[PDB]
Symmetry: D2
Subunit: 264 residues, 4 copies
């Protein structure tokens, strides 16, 4: 049935990293709207506090954790085990923009921090989630958040691009490795996504190039085939589709949700 | 809402080429379940006659046409204009396997027919559909059927692989070209799809390699990360998702629905 | 050392080899001791091959590559003179039409596919029985384009065929590898010469802008900010036919200054 | 002049990281044969001592350095400055295989060490080389060593694959960033390269899968289209070509030198 082909499996146990704001919250709330038992971790106490008692919103569990903090990561899984009691979906969503600048300009600690959060934390969560996901009635799923910078080069954003390409290779390797266990592994590659984060990116890149914000933003928009920024709800919908009967045969793939970003 | 994000727009006017059997029929029937006004063309009179009066199946219009026959393609669009009155989605599904054999063994006329059906017909339908699609209230959509052989090499299937790669290049060019008009253009790449067509392919390749059917089938299954063939309904579900609000912002992409075919 | 010297005495056929990139490749091989033969659709270009002071003799057949009888004449000419084949350079190609997919002449779509795609098959199917007997392991060098790794608005038949070439190369590399035949695509970028100037002119008209503005848009989307020279394409083909490059197969090598987008 | 096209520029000042053994030494020796002023760093004192006084081998400079220690990297560039007096080519060759095992099995410390050496050290050397390379009379070049594991998924080798995909994204980003300065940036992707390193890899993977060395080796070989391993001199040849007039206009590319590894 076409109707239920597109309905995410009911009752999924979902963990979304960096899930109390932005795209991660859009994903977490979308799963929660579909009968999922959702837990998020997030680095922002204010973001976590803002989740509670939102009138139109099912409850979501939350752990304060910086994803590059191993003790904190273990607390996330302890909190998941104590409440969800299992795991069907890991959304490896947490990430930072990293520095903007020439490779000879950027601060080494900012490079390493971008790698630790955007890449090493993907491993830290995947290594702990795999023993849970292999027990999922639906075939376990890992959904990793790459970027259009994981399929294109991105001048003045080398640590960001490096990690987003790394996520693609990590997904394609895990898809082969975990496929026979039943665990699907895909990357979503968001484009230019409307919200506070991209405005910080545009502002920083405008400063890097010596041009105004309005001109920098226009350069981004004219390089989208649809001439329109991506909405976070499009990323959430794609994640839901991967966890529906119709999409649960997809694995090993990077799905760019971007209006066709033509070049960065 | 998450449920609305994943529902195809209501009332879509949809044309599915080669739509009376196999994957094309799964796509046509899926759209028809979601309130679409669906027309198909097909080369098989018997397949077309088998559409009518199936229990719980909404009516689907059909034109008898071989897509390599320009006169019959023109009649397809006349039948669509006289019934649907426009077009919102072109599903460029029609295709053939082509011959199995070394490049120095295969009949040149079979190379040529593979190109005429798998590549040239895509242009024939796209060029006639674009003037209609640019008037679609939703923007318009072209959904091309490539294959995993459009992202991998395929020994002994060179005309098939050449055309399925060509479809990706066509999609990526049209996405740029038509994006500002609002038309989304994507390829779906089916994997090893359960059906009579793949069984004929396996039998032909077994004969090419001098092995039995069951050994050939096992070689294909071992090279799917999920270790199972793709269902036609998965292809249909992906097409429906691209015509939903949540998938409306995807264009210029090839989406492989294949359980991760690792190699051909 | 020896690593970068192409194998001496190679028997090479270059399609569309009497002008442009194809002639660049053909002459480069002839400078390295190869016995080279070309086909070309222009008898004027063929007549210009002879009596070139600094240039070793190159054999030639007049042939439109979409004409099967003409293709068979090329191989008959090669067999009568070269007596074998070590390298097929599938170089012949046309730009095809410039325009929206709903605007272009279907006959020009078909012509682009016939020349850029079907002819690749027509030459490969006849070369393979020769190439598999090569002492060096036979080679097929196919000319794709940066339009074979990027989308190209208003150039859909061209892009479709250049992507097809990549898929054909990757399929043939698997198919023919165990026979020793290497198969690769070279993807030239924005290559200096008369043909790119016709393309820029045609695209400027499509976009209603002047030639100079159209040209500057192409140049600013090359990371090196300069057009590719034909000799670079020729050099890459030679490298694939050297000891150091002869373990490369299944690949598309973009020689383009990094065309960032089309 | 076809001979002038393929020979590297005379007098190139070349730094090869990890250059006293394996592929890196092959590259260093190849450049030294073509009139280059070559310097290497290496983590093994014993490997460095074996460079001296080899018959008809031009002398090569060396610095003892673990590419993950910042002070040793600073000494590398100090020795280069004191002897070469500049830099035309950085060869980012240093790397390790990392651990063999499922993602839930591998030591996190060895995940981290793989990322530190295969990715973070590329940044450490590139950021110090770029100020030198932008003064290169020939324009400057970075040659990064990726792997076929940077264009394919690699089960039970996830840190290695992730870092080798990262190198591709880093290369494509730097090619855009540094192109207008004249610096060419490419990745070479070696396949299954004959040497002691690949025999350790095969041994390790055979133990992971519970098969013998010969069977594991045979699986690798049957998935090379040319059915033979790549020689290190092929990698060196490709590096030399990128530093010739004929290869001078290639940038932003990953070149796989692998006999077509069909799958991992």
């Amino acid at each position: 049935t076409a109707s239920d082909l597109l309905k995410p499996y009911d009752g999924l146990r979902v963990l979304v990293t960096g899930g109390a704001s932005g795209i991660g919250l859009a994903i977490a709330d979308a799963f929660a709207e579909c009968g999922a038992r959702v837990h998020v971790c997030d680095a922002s106490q204010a973001a976590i506090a803002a989740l509670a008692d939102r009138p139109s919103r099912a409850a979501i569990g939350a752990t304060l954790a910086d994803v590059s903090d191993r003790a904190a990561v273990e607390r996330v899984f302890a909190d998941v085990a104590a409440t969800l009691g299992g795991l069907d979906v890991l959304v490896n969503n947490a990430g930072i923009a990293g520095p903007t600048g020439g490779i000879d300009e950027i601060d080494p600690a900012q490079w390493e921090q971008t790698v630790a959060i955007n890449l090493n934390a993907q491993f830290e969560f995947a290594r702990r989630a795999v023993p849970l996901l292999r027990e999922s009635k639906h075939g376990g799923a890992i959904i990793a958040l790459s970027s259009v910078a994981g399929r294109l080069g991105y001048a003045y954003r080398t640590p960001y691009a490096a990690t987003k390409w790394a996520v693609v290779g990590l997904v394609k390797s895990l898809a082969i490795e975990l496929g026979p266990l039943g665990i699907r592994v895909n990357a979503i590659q968001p484009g230019i996504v409307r919200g506070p984060r991209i405005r910080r990116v545009i502002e920083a890149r405008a400063q890097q190039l010596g041009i105004g914000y309005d001109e920098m933003e226009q350069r981004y928009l004219e390089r989208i085939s649809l001439r329109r920024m991506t909405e976070p709800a499009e990323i959430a919908a794609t994640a839901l589709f991967l966890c529906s009967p119709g999409g649960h045969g997809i694995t090993g793939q990077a799905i760019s949700v971007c209006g066709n970003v033509e070049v960065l």
